[PDB]
Write a protein that binds this ligand. Structure first.
Ligand SMILES: NC(=O)C1=CN([C@@H]2O[C@H](COP(=O)(O)OP(=O)(O)OC[C@H]3O[C@@H](n4cnc5c(N)ncnc54)[C@H](O)[C@@H]3O)[C@@H](O)[C@H]2O)C=CC1
Ligand SMILES: NC(=O)C1=CN([C@@H]2O[C@H](COP(=O)(O)OP(=O)(O)OC[C@H]3O[C@@H](n4cnc5c(N)ncnc54)[C@H](O)[C@@H]3O)[C@@H](O)[C@H]2O)C=CC1
Ligand SMILES: NC(=O)C1=CN([C@@H]2O[C@H](COP(=O)(O)OP(=O)(O)OC[C@H]3O[C@@H](n4cnc5c(N)ncnc54)[C@H](O)[C@@H]3O)[C@@H](O)[C@H]2O)C=CC1
Ligand SMILES: NC(=O)C1=CN([C@@H]2O[C@H](COP(=O)(O)OP(=O)(O)OC[C@H]3O[C@@H](n4cnc5c(N)ncnc54)[C@H](O)[C@@H]3O)[C@@H](O)[C@H]2O)C=CC1
Ligand SMILES: O=C(O)C1(C(=O)O)CC1
Ligand SMILES: O=C(O)C1(C(=O)O)CC1
Ligand SMILES: [Mg+2]
Ligand SMILES: [Mg+2]
Ligand SMILES: [Mg+2]
Ligand SMILES: [Mg+2]
Ligand SMILES: [Mg+2]
Ligand SMILES: [Mg+2]
Lengths: 328, 328, 328, 328
């Protein structure tokens, strides 16, 4: 099957590696790779992270200098400034090359064409699905974790080899797995998760609260406690990850099972339509356009929405309560 | 405010208490209350739980005998057999009384009239919001936890006093809180949670999977990994419970925040309508009717739905994967 | 292909067989199997059928006794009392077993979970498609007939072997065929036939009558004669079974062919939608629920519908006519 | 009530004030405040207004210099360049401060987040509802006029005090009133007025003209004369402002009253829906986004719409007529 469990690590030996950023990922991955027996450097703007990285023993230069030295580069920075940073401080130094390699952790800027490097370079992607802290929390046990792999440009016939090489160079495998796919699939998924069921969940909760209060004379404290001020949700998530989404429900009551299943099979079509709409809107690029334009405008909608959300009755009540329970 | 933080414990001293069941709750609460300095007994059918309860030092009699001895009773058994058990082995012994008290952990059977005790008895409810294990996991730290309180019948003018007495007798407060409300609100909430956002979430995930596969040529492994085979969901739940639902999102990226907020404010009305429909359907009693009838029929729909859910592509793929990762 | 034409008969030799019921099927199949060289018994309630079965030379005991003696059982009784009969007089005797086998002629009670035998037993199904009299009417020619096969539980790795063994033990093959499938498919089909085209046909006829009378001044006698008081329909059915559904039409006139084909391809979508709805309603279990509940209620709708049907103008006219033609 | 009629003027004495712009407002307010006994300066780009302000005796420096000198600032410039002007020539000088105050006449740029000053500064708003000339036309009578007040940031507990201080420092009160509100309400109102009834009025007039001509053979001159080429509208506005919107109608005829009231109560719902839509579209920020983007694009729609409006039949006819009547 497409899956991969282990591979070689030779293509990276003898070369120097360049790491852009020392935040969550950059820090973790550079730590691991150094612990794996490789010569690696760090490129970053002069700030707290720079101080931290030079504390932990990673020789540092300026960004463009790290690329001038490196034969491989890992661009571990946000997806909102990578564009300008590339355009200014990378593309030139890169034009001055023959055989180079560039890796990302996300496919947003590439799949949509905001970054079109030369055909003189092999472009790839290695994408984990952990916030970053759990990765160390696993490495100290000597485990592995799963990731996605992708390739965009091949000028060496060695692209996948370098991909698996990196995958092993960050302790993902052996111990976990590695999938192969494109940048497009990665971006599509990372965006569907954010556009489809998360906001739906939140809106459902908000509506349940509003209703239970304003049409059945219920108290905010009780509403919050039942809905989310408890850890029921977290325990459910854990049991899912461990046993399985459906098998999990066995630990509940028959009444819960019955209602859940009925209503789920009953409300499948609506959500299906919603998901179709959003997935299409993404596959085209409309969302990238929208987001870039809002950046250029000044995040007005962002501002107003944050405001409306925090000025809501549910939020105020949650504040009073979380205060009452000593929580921060 | 309606909230309560601590109260007296005198009305329970000098009396004997009766506990029906030694499962999750019964076990925990009886343990605590014994550790609080009260004379308590146990009533249960002769089985593994009976053996366990007599192991832990709780003198036991038959159910009706425990009531004959007790002046208070806690009916900690499922909401699907309580009816018959009451009708047969409790109502008589209870008719033979003057001043008694009966407490539940759920309002399903009462709010809907499936149980109508005499007016010779004060009826109450004390409902926690923890599965039961977390409660001990907190008690050994010396903390408290939150609960709901309710009263249905008063023949003593002491109902709320007994309520708070119990609340303190199970280590809820001081250390947490106690809310006051009816049986109706409790049932309504416990059912809305199960009918509105849980099944919606599950259906959304299922649809995202189906789509991403059958219309964009994506691999099941990647789909599952992104959606739920990871712990992203559990970490989100924890951060919610700790910091706050919205504040949580700060630890994410701006892109995620933007998409989430937009789509949430965009899809609020639909879910609102759904929630209205279900809440009404409950407030009337149609659901209780439906569930009781399906019990009398033989759980055919239950059976078929379990089958359809487990025979699904997502389930089979999850099986293969969870196996691949050593998970049970 | 999945089809089967003949197989072995050894696994049944040396064992005793139990047959529940001596009505249409039970009678025929027991007769055949005895004529095939097997030791078989009969279990039945004391009535006319009991007298008949002991007339024809089948030693009989009470039901539970027949199971105590038997190592295999064929439950040839209606699908409306099998539940209680099992629950009371079979499940105990069965709990007292190690290696047993149970066979049905219908999957209604099992596919929907109304009967959940232990995992100590191999459960199967052998379903013919003849009312029962035609089967003997064929056996005396030395032919075979077609059936369906299914398995639900396997604790021997011999389930299919026993299945084909029975199939041969009732003279189905060699001489006909045997298909393999589940209980679910069998039930689904047997119910679609009854829910989709039979009632549609009847309603179409009824409406044609009503219209031809009340809007074109036609006489009931003529209407009935054309529509169904003749044998046109039976001859068409026979020619279908013999030659083929479409080839049949060759023996009609060109005008008939033209109108039929046009209107058929013209009215396909409506019936398709209807069939989808009903098939879904079944696949879930709603129909089983409905039917069980009507049983528990007292067949009021059944009663009223029988009444309305018989008190109809078409029925009264058919009565007068069938009387006029000497028919009973 | 929230209203205010007079207050103190001490907090401004001993300080220096800075005024950005010498157009309509800036000119008037600076004139008044100087006439009120305060030390005030002027910051403006070198142009005709600079010459005018140094004519009238207001010592001037460059903008940033005026802020370096001032402890308070009034940003009386358009809402389309304030952004860049701030970003470049104000924010630095402001970072170099401890205790400062900044006031606006409009909340557009702030309510939507286009300007986010530091938390080292108290931000306020003082918004009149006169074009600017009427304000002097009233001051020479020794009257006052009404305004709105708002606060965004408080680092002194003196924000409202400074607000009322300014309010008195510009001759608004005593003699008129001062309301308190946010920036959001101000912006919302100033935009609803422009989006809801003004354009509706204009379109209604245009449509009445077009119809009366092209479907009833009426002459343009007569149409214009009746609709707006007369002063009926201005007299109505004046009588409204003086007596009251409804009481005004008393000076009309009964026929007019009847038709007006009927049709008004008849067409309320449509306009209500329109207003809801627009108010929402604003509350979110979509309009700010739209306008900023059109600026960045080059005002193409602006251009084309101006063209279409002026190339209209009504416009050409109005031109011929206004010429015929000697009007410019
Ligand atoms: N933490 C996460 O959520 C995961 C990371 N990724 C992706 O990896 C990439 C890195 O993400 P994170 O390291 O977690 O974010 P982060 O907050 O940890 O970023 C830290 C780095 O940002 C750099 N930086 C910030 N602003 C800069 C600017 N204007 N100019 C130049 N450098 C700047 C700094 O040098 C710093 O080293 C992103 O594309 C992310 O989507 C993929 C899987 C999940
Ligand atoms: N565990 C939970 O989810 C929470 C408990 N509750 C409610 O408290 C009550 C008890 O729930 P749990 O103890 O957690 O369930 P459980 O699974 O722990 O039930 C254990 C008890 O069930 C008794 N029992 C089982 N079948 C019986 C039967 N046919 N006849 C007589 N007794 C029988 C047994 O004596 C045993 O002691 C329920 O109403 C529950 O909804 C309220 C908050 C959450
Ligand atoms: N005979 C037919 O038309 C076909 C029969 N089948 C299936 O074979 C099985 C038997 O069907 P048939 O014999 O044809 O119907 P039937 O009405 O002729 O059944 C006769 C048998 O039912 C027994 N019985 C009736 N009421 C009973 C009760 N209260 N308690 C205990 N036993 C009772 C009688 O002892 C008798 O032996 C069913 O599962 C049916 O679905 C399958 C295809 C059609
Ligand atoms: N006149 C009005 O309609 C009322 C004024 N306001 C608001 O007060 C503020 C000022 O409005 P007005 O003075 O009436 O407009 P205005 O046309 O009178 O503005 C003249 C000033 O604009 C300055 N200026 C123009 N272009 C500039 C540029 N590129 N860079 C730097 N400075 C530039 C000039 O220095 C000049 O002093 C606005 O926000 C307005 O909406 C509030 C109530 C009504
Ligand atoms: O990179 C992303 O966009 C995140 C996701 O996995 O959804 C971390 C927030
Ligand atoms: O008692 C209930 O119905 C549960 C809930 O809180 O939803 C535990 C499952
Ligand atoms: Mg993301
Ligand atoms: Mg994700
Ligand atoms: Mg709950
Ligand atoms: Mg049938
Ligand atoms: Mg059939
Ligand atoms: Mg205005």
């Amino acid at each position: 099957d497409k899956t991969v469990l282990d591979a070689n690590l030779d293509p990276l030996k003898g070369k120097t590696i360049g790491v852009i950023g020392y935040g969550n990922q950059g820090r973790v991955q550079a730590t691991i790779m150094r612990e794996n027996g490789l010569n690696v450097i760090v490129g970053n703007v002069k700030d707290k992270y720079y101080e931290l990285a030079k504390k932990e023993g990673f020789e540092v230069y300026e960004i463009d200098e790290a690329v001038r030295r490196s034969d491989v580069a890992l661009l571990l920075i946000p997806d909102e400034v990578m564009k300008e940073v590339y355009e200014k401080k990378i593309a030139p130094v890169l034009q001055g090359k023959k055989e180079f390699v560039l890796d990302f952790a996300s496919g947003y800027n590439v799949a949509f064409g905001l970054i079109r490097p030369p055909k003189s370079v092999d472009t790839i992607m290695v994408a984990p699905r952990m916030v970053g802290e759990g990765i160390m929390d696993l490495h100290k046990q000597g485990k592995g974790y799963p990731v996605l792999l992708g390739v965009k440009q091949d000028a060496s016939g060695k692209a996948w080899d370098y991909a698996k090489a990196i995958a092993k160079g960050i302790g993902a495998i052996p111990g976990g797995i590695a999938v192969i796919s494109s940048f497009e699939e990665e971006a599509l998924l990372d965006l569907m998760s954010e556009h489809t069921w998360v906001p739906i969940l939140f809106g459902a909760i908000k509506a349940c609260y509003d209703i239970a209060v304003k049409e059945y004379g219920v108290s905010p404290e009780a509403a919050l406690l039942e809905f989310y001020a408890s850890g029921e949700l977290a325990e459910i998530a854990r049991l899912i990850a461990e046993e399985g989404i459906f098998n999990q429900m066995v630990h509940h009551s028959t009444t819960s099972q019955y209602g859940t299943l009925t209503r789920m099979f009953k409300y499948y079509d609506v959500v299906r339509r919603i998901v179709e709409n959003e997935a299409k809107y993404i596959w085209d690029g409309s969302f990238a356009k929208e987001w870039s334009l809002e950046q250029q405008a000044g995040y007005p909608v962002f501002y107003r929405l944050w405001e409306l959300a925090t000025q809501s009755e549910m939020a105020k009540a949650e504040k009073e309560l979380y205060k009452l329970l000593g929580r921060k």
